[PDB]
Short mmCIF file of N, CA and C in Angstrom, two decimals:
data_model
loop_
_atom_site.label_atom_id
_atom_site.label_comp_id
_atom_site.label_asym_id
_atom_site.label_seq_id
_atom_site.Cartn_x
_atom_site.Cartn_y
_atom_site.Cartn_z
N UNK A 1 -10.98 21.63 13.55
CA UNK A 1 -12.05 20.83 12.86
C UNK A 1 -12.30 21.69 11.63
N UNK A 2 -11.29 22.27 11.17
CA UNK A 2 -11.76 22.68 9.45
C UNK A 2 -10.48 22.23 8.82
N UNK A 3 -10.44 22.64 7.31
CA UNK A 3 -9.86 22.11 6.43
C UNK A 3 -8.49 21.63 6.39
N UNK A 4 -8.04 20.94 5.01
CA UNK A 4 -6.63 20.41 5.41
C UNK A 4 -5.69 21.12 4.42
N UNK A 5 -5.71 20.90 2.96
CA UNK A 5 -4.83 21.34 1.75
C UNK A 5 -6.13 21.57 0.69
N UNK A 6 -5.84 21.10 -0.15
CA UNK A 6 -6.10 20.82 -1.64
C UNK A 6 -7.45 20.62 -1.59
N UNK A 7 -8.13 19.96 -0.78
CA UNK A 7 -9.38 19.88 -0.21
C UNK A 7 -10.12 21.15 -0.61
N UNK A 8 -11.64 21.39 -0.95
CA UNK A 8 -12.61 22.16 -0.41
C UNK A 8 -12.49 23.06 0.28
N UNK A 9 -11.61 24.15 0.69
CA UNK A 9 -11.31 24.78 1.94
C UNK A 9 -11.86 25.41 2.52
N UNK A 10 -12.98 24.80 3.52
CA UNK A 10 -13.70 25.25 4.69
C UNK A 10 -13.33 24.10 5.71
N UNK A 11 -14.02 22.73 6.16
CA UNK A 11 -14.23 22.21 7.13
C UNK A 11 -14.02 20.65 6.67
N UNK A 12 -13.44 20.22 5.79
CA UNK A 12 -13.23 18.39 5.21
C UNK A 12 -11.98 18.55 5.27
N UNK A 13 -11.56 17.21 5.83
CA UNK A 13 -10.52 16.49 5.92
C UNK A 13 -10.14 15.34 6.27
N UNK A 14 -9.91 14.45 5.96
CA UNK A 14 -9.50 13.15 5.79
C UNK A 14 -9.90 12.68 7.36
N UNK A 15 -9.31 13.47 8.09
CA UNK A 15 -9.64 13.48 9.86
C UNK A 15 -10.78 13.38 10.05
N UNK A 16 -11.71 13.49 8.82
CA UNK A 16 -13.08 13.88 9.19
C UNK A 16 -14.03 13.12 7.94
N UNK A 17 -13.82 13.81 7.16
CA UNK A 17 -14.58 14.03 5.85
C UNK A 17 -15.06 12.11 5.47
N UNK A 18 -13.52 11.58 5.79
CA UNK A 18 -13.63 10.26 5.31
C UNK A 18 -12.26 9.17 5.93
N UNK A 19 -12.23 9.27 7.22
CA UNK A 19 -10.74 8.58 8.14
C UNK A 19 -10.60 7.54 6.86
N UNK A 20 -10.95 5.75 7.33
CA UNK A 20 -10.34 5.37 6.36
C UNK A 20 -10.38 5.43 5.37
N UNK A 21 -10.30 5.88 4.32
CA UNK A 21 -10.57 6.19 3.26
C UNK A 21 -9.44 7.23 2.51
N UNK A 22 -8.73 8.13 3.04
CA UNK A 22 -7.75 9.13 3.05
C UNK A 22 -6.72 8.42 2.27
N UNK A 23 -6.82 7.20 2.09
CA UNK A 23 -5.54 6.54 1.11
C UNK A 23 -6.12 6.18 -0.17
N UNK A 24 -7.37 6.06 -0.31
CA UNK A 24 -8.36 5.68 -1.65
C UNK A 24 -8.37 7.37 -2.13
N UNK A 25 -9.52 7.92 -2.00
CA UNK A 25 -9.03 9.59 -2.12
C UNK A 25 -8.06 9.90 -2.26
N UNK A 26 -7.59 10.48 -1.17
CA UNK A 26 -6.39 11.45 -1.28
C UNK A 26 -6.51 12.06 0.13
N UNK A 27 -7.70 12.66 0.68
CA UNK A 27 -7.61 13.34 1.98
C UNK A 27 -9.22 13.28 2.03
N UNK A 28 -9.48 14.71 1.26
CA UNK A 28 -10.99 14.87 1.52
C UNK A 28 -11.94 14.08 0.19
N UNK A 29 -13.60 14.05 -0.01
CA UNK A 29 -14.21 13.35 -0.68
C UNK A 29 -15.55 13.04 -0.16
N UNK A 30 -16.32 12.37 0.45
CA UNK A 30 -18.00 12.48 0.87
C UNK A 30 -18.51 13.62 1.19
N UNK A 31 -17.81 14.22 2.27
CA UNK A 31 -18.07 15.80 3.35
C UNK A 31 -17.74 16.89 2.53
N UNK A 32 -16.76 16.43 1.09
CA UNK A 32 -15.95 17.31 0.45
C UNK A 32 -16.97 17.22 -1.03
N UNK A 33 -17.24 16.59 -1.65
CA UNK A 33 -17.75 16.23 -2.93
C UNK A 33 -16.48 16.90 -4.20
N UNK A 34 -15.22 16.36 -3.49
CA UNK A 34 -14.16 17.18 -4.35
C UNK A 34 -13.75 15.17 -4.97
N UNK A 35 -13.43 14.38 -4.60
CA UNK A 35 -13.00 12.75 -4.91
C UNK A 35 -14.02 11.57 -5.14
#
């Protein structure tokens, strides 16, 4: 339950941060404030 790539790197990831959504983004983005 922490990070994935390119992401924020602590604890966001698409798995998490924002499931469907990971194809609009990219991976991370709400949990991330990186997208």
């Amino acid at each position: 339950r922490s990070a994935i790539d390119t992401i924020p790197k602590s604890r966001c990831t698409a798995f998490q941060c924002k499931h469907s959504a990971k194809y609009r983004l990219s991976f991370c983005r709400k949990t991330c404030g990186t997208a």
